[PDB]
Design an enzyme around this catalytic site. Sequence first.
Site, mmCIF file in Angstrom:
data_model
loop_
_atom_site.group_PDB
_atom_site.id
_atom_site.type_symbol
_atom_site.label_atom_id
_atom_site.label_comp_id
_atom_site.label_asym_id
_atom_site.label_seq_id
_atom_site.Cartn_x
_atom_site.Cartn_y
_atom_site.Cartn_z
ATOM 1 N N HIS A 61 0.803 -1.257 0.048
ATOM 2 C CA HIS A 61 -0.068 -0.137 0.136
ATOM 3 C C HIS A 61 0.972 1.293 -0.086
ATOM 4 O O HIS A 61 0.440 2.257 -0.418
ATOM 5 C CB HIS A 61 -1.015 -0.037 1.242
ATOM 6 N N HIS A 91 6.595 7.060 5.328
ATOM 7 C CA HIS A 91 6.199 6.702 4.056
ATOM 8 C C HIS A 91 5.523 7.625 3.343
ATOM 9 O O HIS A 91 5.384 9.126 4.108
ATOM 10 C CB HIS A 91 5.328 5.637 4.192
ATOM 11 N N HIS A 93 1.867 9.075 0.696
ATOM 12 C CA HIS A 93 0.679 8.858 0.014
ATOM 13 C C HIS A 93 0.779 9.760 -1.141
ATOM 14 O O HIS A 93 1.300 11.081 -1.017
ATOM 15 C CB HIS A 93 -0.366 9.132 1.024
ATOM 16 N N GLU A 103 -3.509 13.514 2.254
ATOM 17 C CA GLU A 103 -4.549 12.795 3.055
ATOM 18 C C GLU A 103 -5.342 13.901 3.551
ATOM 19 O O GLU A 103 -6.548 14.031 3.353
ATOM 20 C CB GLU A 103 -3.959 11.586 3.829
ATOM 21 N N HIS A 116 4.549 10.975 5.819
ATOM 22 C CA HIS A 116 4.266 10.874 7.315
ATOM 23 C C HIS A 116 5.357 10.195 7.776
ATOM 24 O O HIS A 116 5.757 8.964 7.405
ATOM 25 C CB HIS A 116 3.023 9.723 7.383
ATOM 26 N N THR A 195 -4.322 6.173 8.963
ATOM 27 C CA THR A 195 -5.046 6.418 8.114
ATOM 28 C C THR A 195 -5.142 5.289 7.156
ATOM 29 O O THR A 195 -5.808 5.201 6.128
ATOM 30 C CB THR A 195 -4.597 7.614 7.303
HETATM 31 C C1 MB4 Z 1 -0.966 -1.965 13.497
HETATM 32 C C2 MB4 Z 1 0.359 -2.346 13.505
HETATM 33 C C3 MB4 Z 1 0.804 -2.655 14.758
HETATM 34 C C4 MB4 Z 1 1.978 -3.237 15.293
HETATM 35 C C5 MB4 Z 1 2.975 -3.415 14.367
HETATM 36 C C6 MB4 Z 1 2.649 -2.988 13.137
HETATM 37 C C7 MB4 Z 1 1.274 -2.777 12.670
HETATM 38 S S1 MB4 Z 1 1.150 -2.490 11.089
HETATM 39 O O1 MB4 Z 1 2.338 -2.504 10.350
HETATM 40 O O2 MB4 Z 1 0.658 -3.814 10.491
HETATM 41 N N1 MB4 Z 1 0.297 -1.256 10.891
HETATM 42 C C8 MB4 Z 1 0.545 0.250 10.819
HETATM 43 O O3 MB4 Z 1 1.870 0.227 11.093
HETATM 44 N N2 MB4 Z 1 -0.376 0.835 10.326
HETATM 45 C C9 MB4 Z 1 -0.146 2.272 10.041
HETATM 46 C C10 MB4 Z 1 1.085 2.882 10.413
HETATM 47 C C11 MB4 Z 1 0.791 4.496 9.816
HETATM 48 C C12 MB4 Z 1 -0.055 4.868 9.584
HETATM 49 S S2 MB4 Z 1 -0.298 6.590 9.027
HETATM 50 N N3 MB4 Z 1 -1.581 7.129 9.898
HETATM 51 O O4 MB4 Z 1 0.593 7.204 9.244
HETATM 52 O O5 MB4 Z 1 -0.758 6.550 7.493
HETATM 53 N N4 MB4 Z 1 -1.167 3.915 9.211
HETATM 54 C C13 MB4 Z 1 -1.245 2.874 9.647
HETATM 55 ZN ZN ZN Z 2 0.444 7.443 6.332
#
Ligand code: MB4
Ligand code: ZN
EC number: 4.2.1.1
Length: 257
Positions: A61, A91, A93, A103, A116, A195
């Site tokens: 993604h 990363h 978007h 976003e 981000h 997000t």
């Molecule tokens: C869940 C989670 C929990 C623990 C370790 C890894 C993960 S994950 O890698 O599967 N998911 C995320 O890290 N999600 C993530 C990170 C950052 C953002 S954002 N808000 O910067 O775009 N959104 C979703």
């Molecule tokens: Zn992000």
Amino acid sequence: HWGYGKHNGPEHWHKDFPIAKGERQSPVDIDTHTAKYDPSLKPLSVSYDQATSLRILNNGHAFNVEFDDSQDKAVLKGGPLDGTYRLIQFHFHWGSLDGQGSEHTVDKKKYAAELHLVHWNTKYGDFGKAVQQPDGLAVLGIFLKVGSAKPGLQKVVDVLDSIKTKGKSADFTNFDPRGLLPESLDYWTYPGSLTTPPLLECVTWIVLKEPISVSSEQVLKFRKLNFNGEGEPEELMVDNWRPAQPLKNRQIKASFK
Ligand SMILES: Cc1ccccc1S(=O)(=O)NC(=O)Nc1ccc(S(N)(=O)=O)nc1
Ligand SMILES: [Zn+2]
């Protein structure tokens, strides 16, 4: 299952992740005239001098540049934050076209992309625990517009061909995230969420007012990445952004007049 297509995109996420319709979802539109200046907000402290980047990963993604977060090496403090938040990854978007991709929006304006920088609160010990807390994460959001090249971005751009498809990673040491920052650290801040799924409501959002400029050639290389894995049908990694969510019972604060 989730993604950014017609059948698995943001409007479908609530079925697996009901918090998608929660009370503090991100991103949001930043209405600049309604954001209130908060003179008690402190200057942001971005301390990335000791940052240790390790790897760059295409996760299906976006692409993450990952850092060593086992010590206080790259930390965000001050601003709206209490305590110390460690940089774990950054990363972006981005859009299929320069007119969309961010976003967060600013008075409904969409930027070409959004960076981000994801940090977790050290009081919770690791990232996995931090995402379960309402003050677990601090994400520094930086808008990208298309214009002059960003020299500090080029090392990222040039490795992308080696991580074209989902699941590919490449060594990515000695990258300095300071080269991605704008001149000013003036910001807006509000309580929000991840997000992408799991959309957890664990983020203090800090979104910088000053965008960085990147070149058309730089963003074009983002758009050459693939959502799919190697050997699967090619689907370009573009428009991997969630649209603005309802502000609901939240106030956006500004660090500046
Ligand atoms: C869940 C989670 C929990 C623990 C370790 C890894 C993960 S994950 O890698 O599967 N998911 C995320 O890290 N999600 C993530 C990170 C950052 C953002 S954002 N808000 O910067 O775009 N959104 C979703
Ligand atoms: Zn992000």
